[PDB]
RNA sequence: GCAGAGGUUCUAGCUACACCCUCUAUAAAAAACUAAGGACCACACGA
């Protein structure tokens, strides 16, 4: 309930902003092994600025195209680490975000379409597993690099 | 009593206050509760429904096509006419429930999936019929669970649940890309049974032309259903620009992979069923069909891959 | 009481000739499963058809052995051989020759036809040559049989595919004629490798069957 | 009879226009005399006028344009 | 009885008071589906005012989950009984052991998905021996209470209905009883003054079993009551 | 659906006619909320 | 004492027997387990609920 | 092929009897037996009591003095007696019995036609000295299970639901026959379990009779 | 058929959500038909 009254304010008003702010997706690591690839952390979601191969000043992905599952299997392949992404929070936009700053629909595979509620989505996807959820040296190196 | 009596405040504020019990989320007609019930022969597009329900809920639809066709002249002879359930009724009952959607409603709406459009199909019996793939995504058991059906009234209504709350429409689900109707609890562990394989089985060892000649030779008893054969398929691949390029090899396998063969739709791979084929294989294998072949033939794939499914665990007897 | 609603026909979907999909709507509760399985097995494990049993290569003695030149191994052109779908007249065995040389596929077009024995499938691709001095011939044996003889149970023995039926499989759903019982409703989808018809392979099966009960038919 | 409407989406890109679109087409269908163009098979009009959007010759600017034409024959009906 | 159990079943059908259980032991004179009569021993009864036991056992009754509170009889005549024995099987009660459901056969598979996850599959033979057929008790009481401008009849002159309605009801207006009703039927006639009577709910059914009227001091009964 | 009784009306009487159109209107659970607001001594009101 | 019990009658020790299908007519692999366990019926009728 | 014939009809019991079937080849067997059990099982013309009627007993729940058990428990054994006629589609059995006994099927004054094929099959038990019940039994023909609530006066009558079904366990076995000289013969042995009212020959013959004419659809006859 | 009354039935029937015909101050040749009310607190149970 709370989750979903701090949002349903917050719609998909517009298509782009022209923002090149964002956050730099990475992988995350908790002193372990990596949790969650990076290639399915930043799947469906748009860039904010042109990601690069180890060769420099390359262009391996344009600066607001969406990352779907062909662009981030090339992405695994040419072994990237982290790519700045158009996030949410980062949008301009007044009263809602653009339906690039927001990314892929999550369940069209496709970018979000311009109007469609994603707070209420969001608060549900959120609170869904709620009922799923529970109540109560030295440093050594794992493998070889 | 000696209760607190209720004032001008406490019918503003609270769970029983006007706003959160009559205006953020109120009561509606057109409505009907009963006990869900399996009915596997249904597709997810649609979902059973008993034959009162849909009397009592489309009333006005069969008092409006009633007075269209001339059978009553009034709603209230009309109305008379509903209550006998006279023999015409049922087959005017049927016209409007041809493409007419029904909002199918568990009671703790969790997240968006919880409510999803159906085709009603009219059953006898008292239970509403819920398409099992649909079953995990509304949390839903067939253990007393009870969802509330609604019936979308305007053609802006009912072509919007057509259009976004139909179960096809509703494959993957809000909170992650990975699919929501995937093959939950018995047609997995049919698929599971069917993708294995004996070292020594019944009729192994010979090549087949095809999978249509594993299902002959299996449903003919003559071969076991997972024994380690040679296979001819012709697996499609679209490697081309959007066209599908045919490759034809002898791929060693099992006759139960070989079966699966032709329900997966002709773009998928063969790498895709020549596993175990658990939870997660036949996630990825769904995930992968909606992402390269789209949404019609993954929902068609998935209520073939669901009949096989069942048909072959009840075949296995997994006792 | 000895009165039943028996079916008719509704809706034949004629697939191409290879394939169709036969219905019944009316039919009995619990007999559209009777039927279906009935005729699956009566059409799946016995029915009167011709197939390859047996391949003798003139340079190959032994399975696990290719000839040079073609790029299908002998294991892989016994299988194109085993879905060579032939028709035969009254005689219940022939020996079919395939004499041929070139660089080029060897289409079932090919086979002699040592008779009136037809192939219903000419352009039916039994194996490729690549080389113009590169020759492959072989004697085909084929006969009647009455079901499926897989090569297990018994020159290069190849599985016998007699039955002409190539995939069955029936769906029972519900057909409710007026405002009756939830009656059957029989919808067969059948494939058959062109000998005869699918429509024409589902009567034979069923005339077998019905043939079967000629003396339990009451007079 | 339809199952889902993937094509008519790919036809119109928005997945909430084709709703609006295709709502004004069930109710010219169904409040005017406008003959649907793909013929019916038993069909409502909800599933008609996806149809005829799946075919591509019905959306949100040929309805408009056709019904801003029947407007004009309108206006020059009396002269 | 169940095949399975724990030996409870006895104690607690025994101790609840679902069953006739027998006060004093004897020999059963006289049997009845209504009535069972015990014919006290010598050595088990007083010498003043001992006489014979006789157990009226509770027909199909109105129970607080309408169901039917039903004894049956589980002896026959001469057979003898002792002291704190069971006599009458009680609902859900099967020889004096508690009986709640049915047993049968059972076959642990899946079968077409029919018991997809949780889902029970029951064959026609269930159905058609009737193992789970039970009897529901409904209460539809009809008031007459005092109404402005004269109050209202419970006679049989009902307006805008049929003749068909009507047949089941008697000539004072209410149903016969032992009639078969059905949805949307009607019981008893009343009508208020100026079409009230009392209806069977649409969807239940069944067979009216007894009707019982209660009239206050001072009105004048009908011809049923 | 649920408690505009004008909009109740016309949604029956469309349906019986054929015309599955809807009247909006305006539910009568939200003008009860501003009788019972106003009744607290808290003017809320609708601009036009 | 179960084991024992089902050799007591002619009924396999392992409590599991070969079925066949109602439709098909042929018996299931992998012989499944029948009985007769004591079921109930809950006062949740469908009738009530519609 | 071959064909079938009534080789052997081992009349175990008096209620289920080993009917045998010898000429069948590979399928056949299997095939044959498992459509005769689905046809036997699903309809065999049974002639099951369907309507009955008390001297003096308004309705199904009520108790009369004198007899054991309720009268709903004796509707219920009265669906279990196996009742077969010959000539009528419908007879009315009239059931008088007085003074202290068990109520068994034999006491029915049967017609010329109809006659019980379980003389032992109890009833009810009447206890007073001064009991007797008299009832109507309305017994009809019929095809499968109808119940009496999904069918189509008088408030005396007591509706019992209907069980048209001779047959109630057909278990068939495939084993190789003992022919002069041949082998892929198989024999089918059905074990049919009946009620008594049907005999295992014409209730044999009548499945197929039913298989023949469904099959019919696709073979001229 | 929009403001009222009458009609062949059955006190009364004028669109009351409501069913047929007449006209603006007058009552009958006519068959299918009729009714528009209804909260809170506790208990137990299901998911
Ligand atoms: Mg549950």
Redesign the pocket.
Known sequence: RRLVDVAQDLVVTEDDCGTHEGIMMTPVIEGGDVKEPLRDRVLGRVTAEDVLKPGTADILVPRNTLLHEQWCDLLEENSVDAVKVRSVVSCDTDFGVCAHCYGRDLARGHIINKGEAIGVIAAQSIGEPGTQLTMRSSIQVKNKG | ?K?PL?SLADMIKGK?GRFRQNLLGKRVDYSGRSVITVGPYLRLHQCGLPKKMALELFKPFIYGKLELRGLA?????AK?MVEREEAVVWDILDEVIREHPVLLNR??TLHRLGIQAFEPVLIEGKAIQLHPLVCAAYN??F????MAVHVPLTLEAQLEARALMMSTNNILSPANGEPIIVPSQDVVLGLYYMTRDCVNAKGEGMVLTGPKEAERLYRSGLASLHARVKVRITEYEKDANGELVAKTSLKDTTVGRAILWMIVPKGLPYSIVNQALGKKAISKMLNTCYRILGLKPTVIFADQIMYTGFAYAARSGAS | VTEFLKPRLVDIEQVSSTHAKVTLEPLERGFGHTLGNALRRILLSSMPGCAVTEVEIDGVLHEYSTKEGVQEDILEILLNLKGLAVRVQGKDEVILTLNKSGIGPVTAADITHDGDVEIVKPQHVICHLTDENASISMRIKVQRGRGYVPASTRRLLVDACYSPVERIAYNVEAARVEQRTDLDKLVIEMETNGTIDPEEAIRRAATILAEQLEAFVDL | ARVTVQDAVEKIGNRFDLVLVAARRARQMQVGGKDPLVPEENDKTTVIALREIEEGLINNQILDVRERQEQQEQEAAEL | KPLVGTGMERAVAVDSGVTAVAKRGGVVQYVDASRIVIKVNEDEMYPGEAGIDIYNLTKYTRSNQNTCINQMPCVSLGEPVERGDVLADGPSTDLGELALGQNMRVAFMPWNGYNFEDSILVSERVVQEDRFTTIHIQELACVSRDTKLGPEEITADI??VGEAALSKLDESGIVYIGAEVTGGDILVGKVTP??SSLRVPNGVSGTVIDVQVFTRDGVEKDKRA | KSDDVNGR?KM??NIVDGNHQMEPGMPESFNVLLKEIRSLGINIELED | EIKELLKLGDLPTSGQIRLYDGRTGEQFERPVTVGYMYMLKLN?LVDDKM
């Open positions: 009593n209760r209720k029983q002249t009034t709603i209230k002879a008379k009671a703790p839903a058991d253990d007393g669970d009870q | 307006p805008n100026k079409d | 009306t029956y009487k | 949740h």
